[PDB]
Design a protein around this ligand. Sequence first.
Ligand SMILES: OC[C@H]1O[C@@H](O)[C@H](O)[C@@H](O)[C@@H]1O
Ligand SMILES: OC[C@H]1O[C@@H](O)[C@H](O)[C@@H](O)[C@@H]1O
Ligand SMILES: OC[C@H]1O[C@@H](O)[C@H](O)[C@@H](O)[C@@H]1O
Ligand SMILES: OC[C@H]1O[C@@H](O)[C@H](O)[C@@H](O)[C@@H]1O
Ligand SMILES: OC[C@H]1O[C@@H](O)[C@H](O)[C@@H](O)[C@@H]1O
Ligand SMILES: OC[C@H]1O[C@@H](O)[C@H](O)[C@@H](O)[C@@H]1O
Ligand SMILES: OC[C@H]1O[C@@H](O)[C@H](O)[C@@H](O)[C@@H]1O
Ligand SMILES: OC[C@H]1O[C@@H](O)[C@H](O)[C@@H](O)[C@@H]1O
Ligand SMILES: [Cl-]
Ligand SMILES: [Cl-]
Ligand SMILES: [Cl-]
Ligand SMILES: [Cl-]
Ligand SMILES: [Cl-]
Ligand SMILES: [Cl-]
Ligand SMILES: [Cl-]
Ligand SMILES: [Cl-]
Ligand SMILES: [Cl-]
Ligand SMILES: [Cl-]
Ligand SMILES: [Cl-]
Ligand SMILES: [Cl-]
Ligand SMILES: [Cl-]
Ligand SMILES: [Cl-]
Ligand code: NA
Ligand code: NA
Ligand code: NA
Ligand code: NA
Ligand code: NA
Ligand code: NA
Ligand code: NA
Ligand code: NA
Lengths: 344, 344
Amino acid sequence: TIALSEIVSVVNTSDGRLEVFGVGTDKAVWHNRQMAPHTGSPWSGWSSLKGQVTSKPVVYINTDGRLEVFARGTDNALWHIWQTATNAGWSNWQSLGGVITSNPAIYANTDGRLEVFARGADNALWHISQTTAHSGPWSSWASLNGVITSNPTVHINSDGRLEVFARGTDNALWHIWQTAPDSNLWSSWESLNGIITSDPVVIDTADGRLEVFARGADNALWHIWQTISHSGPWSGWQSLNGVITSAPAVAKNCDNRLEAFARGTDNALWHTWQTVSHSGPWSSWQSLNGVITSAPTAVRDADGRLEVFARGTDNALWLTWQTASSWSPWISLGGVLIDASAIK
Amino acid sequence: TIALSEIVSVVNTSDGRLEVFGVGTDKAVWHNRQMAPHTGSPWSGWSSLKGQVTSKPVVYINTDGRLEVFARGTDNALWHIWQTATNAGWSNWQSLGGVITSNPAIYANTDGRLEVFARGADNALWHISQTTAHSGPWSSWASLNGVITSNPTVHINSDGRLEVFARGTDNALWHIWQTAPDSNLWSSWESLNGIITSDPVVIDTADGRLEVFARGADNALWHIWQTISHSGPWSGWQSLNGVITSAPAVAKNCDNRLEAFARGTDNALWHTWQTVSHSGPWSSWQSLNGVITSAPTAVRDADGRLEVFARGTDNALWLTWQTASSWSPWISLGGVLIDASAIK
Ligand SMILES: OC[C@H]1O[C@@H](O)[C@H](O)[C@@H](O)[C@@H]1O
Ligand SMILES: OC[C@H]1O[C@@H](O)[C@H](O)[C@@H](O)[C@@H]1O
Ligand SMILES: OC[C@H]1O[C@@H](O)[C@H](O)[C@@H](O)[C@@H]1O
Ligand SMILES: OC[C@H]1O[C@@H](O)[C@H](O)[C@@H](O)[C@@H]1O
Ligand SMILES: OC[C@H]1O[C@@H](O)[C@H](O)[C@@H](O)[C@@H]1O
Ligand SMILES: OC[C@H]1O[C@@H](O)[C@H](O)[C@@H](O)[C@@H]1O
Ligand SMILES: OC[C@H]1O[C@@H](O)[C@H](O)[C@@H](O)[C@@H]1O
Ligand SMILES: OC[C@H]1O[C@@H](O)[C@H](O)[C@@H](O)[C@@H]1O
Ligand SMILES: [Cl-]
Ligand SMILES: [Cl-]
Ligand SMILES: [Cl-]
Ligand SMILES: [Cl-]
Ligand SMILES: [Cl-]
Ligand SMILES: [Cl-]
Ligand SMILES: [Cl-]
Ligand SMILES: [Cl-]
Ligand SMILES: [Cl-]
Ligand SMILES: [Cl-]
Ligand SMILES: [Cl-]
Ligand SMILES: [Cl-]
Ligand SMILES: [Cl-]
Ligand SMILES: [Cl-]
Ligand code: NA
Ligand code: NA
Ligand code: NA
Ligand code: NA
Ligand code: NA
Ligand code: NA
Ligand code: NA
Ligand code: NA
């Protein structure tokens, strides 16, 4: 098992609007979007992109600005749907085949080719890519091996190499990296040790270091980072303390200060942040209240403010954001969302 | 003629450091870089990358994080030098041939291929590109036609199409765009009218609109913008007032508020900014003092603060940056910089 998952995927569109993707009780993908590129914008309300998903749906922006959503189908194949034009209409759901046993994890190579990673029926990591920038056709599936017990997460290093993180059978954090940008040449799997009890989340620091966050065996928030830009060694695991009852979410403030969010034991949203400057000391854990039934999902909007989404007791999606002084009261975006995570 | 030019090219490196490129009295390219990814970092001091340039040297970051500098040679060919590895050492200067009669203008296509634009001996716009992402070999040269009387500037639209801006023989602002990302298919040249007396500068708004700034016939700062994301019509020319004695520079605050900088009649640095939120009303023009002998160069650092560089009366490069309350006193980074602009 893993800590309670994020229930939505969110992106900041090519025109600076937040757009959020979730799953309804009938297993269709629904989306909600800001009308205007500003904190506290009115929302569309939930509309259906249809489909029948058995994973968290994961949105990623092509290098031409077209959103593309990836999800496991009821046949355990990887399916996707894409905007036919930037912030315009959507394709039908189409199958990329395979058999996957995790949520998909997506990143753009330096050459604009999306690459998708997912656990397979053999519990190894598999991958498939666009063959040219933001375009089909897609490559054949292949495996990067390993034995995976969490959803994987991919990021890009500051030198353009993709790097993937996942829990192993020993509950350690393991990773594998491209040896060159845009490559099908990968390293061996290596262990970053620790004991993690959530999916890992990964982000790039202002200074081009990958930093991974995960819940520990003691239900504290732990993190580990590249000690120098796009390079080993890693820092070794450090505790940010707290007692968390969901996966953590991480985002960057517009001054690049990292900020971590998670559900506490009182089922409120809690957060801790780098103080003063990026890579500065972490704050005490503080409450943003609410009563939430999912991990929080954190994103920086077009005004450079963090906005956090979480499911409420009513299964609606609720929203709170940074203000000059503190954070807004929670407001409901309605809907009825389920946790469709392929790994729980 | 055009308003007094920016004398340096600056970028925020893949590891969050400012790195600035200028020209010395013996026509070599020199660079200065922050040691640390923070406002008020110590600087390297100026070191020579050698070469013999007859244009402003223009740095651009490859999609793999490697800096690449472009400049006209004494043979009027396009030359370049690149990092052999991200924030590591440099190649020798190598020729991409051609005959150019402007500073080069560079952008990355959505597919990671750098594309360089420059005026030719026929006064038309010419272009050359990497044939694969962040890699040689380079394409053949070809022309996009037009008749150009300023340095050109290129940007990317929020749908991935490159768009180039330049003054024409009628002193109007003209532009041309790719009809598809990564394409060799371009529009015809179209006039955005006006009368401009500086090089144009172009930036993308938080909400994915191109916005162009230029000095007008009345020596005020004027701007014009796409009315909707990656689309016409344009707004028509609007004055931001002021009386400026250099080209303007533009940068985005970390909340995406646009801020414009230019030399005033008192030879001090002046600025005007969007107030409250991105796309909000523009402020009064305010002084940041100094006595400057170049256009200012503005960049957002890894702490999300604007830093502005300008040549002083001593021909040293000086620097002032945003603080919580206002702006820092000017400090000198030394050196002896010339305006090597291929168009003056
Ligand atoms: O280029 C438009 C779209 O074409 C489809 O064939 C691909 O499967 C998508 O991944 C791509 O975004
Ligand atoms: O070679 C670069 C790679 O080196 C390894 O030692 C690190 O653990 C990776 O995170 C890094 O991407
Ligand atoms: O530079 C080292 C710093 O890196 C940051 O990314 C971490 O969150 C800090 O905890 C750490 O002290
Ligand atoms: O602005 C600095 C920090 O101050 C705290 O009071 C806010 O709640 C954080 O979300 C923010 O990152
Ligand atoms: O790929 C490394 C470098 O190779 C050279 O051949 C190209 O001319 C450069 O533009 C490129 O950055
Ligand atoms: O077709 C898209 C293009 O349309 C033109 O009308 C606009 O002037 C361009 O700025 C835009 O890139
Ligand atoms: O949305 C319209 C606004 O766009 C901004 O990018 C301009 O700088 C403003 O002057 C304009 O009012
Ligand atoms: O922070 C809002 C604005 O306030 C002014 O006082 C600063 O000098 C500007 O540079 C800044 O964009
Ligand atoms: Cl549904
Ligand atoms: Cl379709
Ligand atoms: Cl469909
Ligand atoms: Cl392996
Ligand atoms: Cl728990
Ligand atoms: Cl943004
Ligand atoms: Cl559920
Ligand atoms: Cl020199
Ligand atoms: Cl070389
Ligand atoms: Cl050389
Ligand atoms: Cl034409
Ligand atoms: Cl003047
Ligand atoms: Cl930055
Ligand atoms: Cl000079
Ligand atoms: Na955006
Ligand atoms: Na890559
Ligand atoms: Na990721
Ligand atoms: Na996740
Ligand atoms: Na950077
Ligand atoms: Na392009
Ligand atoms: Na440009
Ligand atoms: Na310029």
